[PDB]
Amino acid sequence: GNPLVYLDVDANGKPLGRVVLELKADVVPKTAENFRALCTGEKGFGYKGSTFHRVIPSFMCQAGDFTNHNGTGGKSIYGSRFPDENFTLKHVGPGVLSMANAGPNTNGSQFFICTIKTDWLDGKHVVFGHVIEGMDVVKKIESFGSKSGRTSKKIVITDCGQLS
Ligand SMILES: O[C@@H]1CO[C@@H]2C[C@H]1Nc1ccc(F)cc12
Numbered sequence: 001g002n003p004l005v006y007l008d009v010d011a012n013g014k015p016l017g018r019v020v021l022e023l024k025a026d027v028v029p030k031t032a033e034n035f036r037a038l039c040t041g042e043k044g045f046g047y048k049g050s051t052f053h054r055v056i057p058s059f060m061c062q063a064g065d066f067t068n069h070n071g072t073g074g075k076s077i078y079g080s081r082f083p084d085e086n087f088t089l090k091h092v093g094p095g096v097l098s099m100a101n102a103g104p105n106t107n108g109s110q111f112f113i114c115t116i117k118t119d120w121l122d123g124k125h126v127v128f129g130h131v132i133e134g135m136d137v138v139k140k141i142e143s144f145g146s147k148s149g150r151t152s153k154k155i156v157i158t159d160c161g162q163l164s
Pocket residue numbers: 071072073102103106
């Protein structure tokens with residue numbers, strides 16, 4: 001079946017809790033595999049020790065830039081970027097896990113967790129999972145955001161991996 005992955009998040013060195021995500025490998029296997037391996041760190045690089053660098057209240061919480069920590073970086077397990085697998089899953093509401101990008105077919109490692117229905121991103125961003133547990137943690141992350149995306153606290157993924 002589909003993998004379950006986790007992100008243990010800190011805000012200025014104090015733990016906020018765990019966000020558990022279901023990766024829709026059934027619909028987007030390439031995109032789900034990329035995220036899964038980046039959580040376990042089995043390819044020699046991944047999300048552990050990196051940040052939520054772009055957090056916007058009433059929109060989303062963006063992370064995944066483990067190379068530059070500023071929105072210009074991160075990489076996939078396949079290479080520096082990979083194609084948009086498909087646009088089958090929609091940005092239906094809060095809790096949606098989707099890929100961050102810089103235009104068509106520029107998927108790396110950067111991703112976001114929606115805090116609202118982001119329907120205008122359908123056909124532009126690849127949806128590949130959703131929050132199973134820890135939406136209270138996502139809401140804590142959100143509260144440390146601003147309109148610019150700048151965080152008021154340093155939000156770090158201290159640990160991440162695969163549950164099943
Ligand atoms: O072709 C340009 C240059 O490279 C990629 C795709 C596209 N826009 C962009 C923006 C930010 C970034 F960090 C990386 C990129």
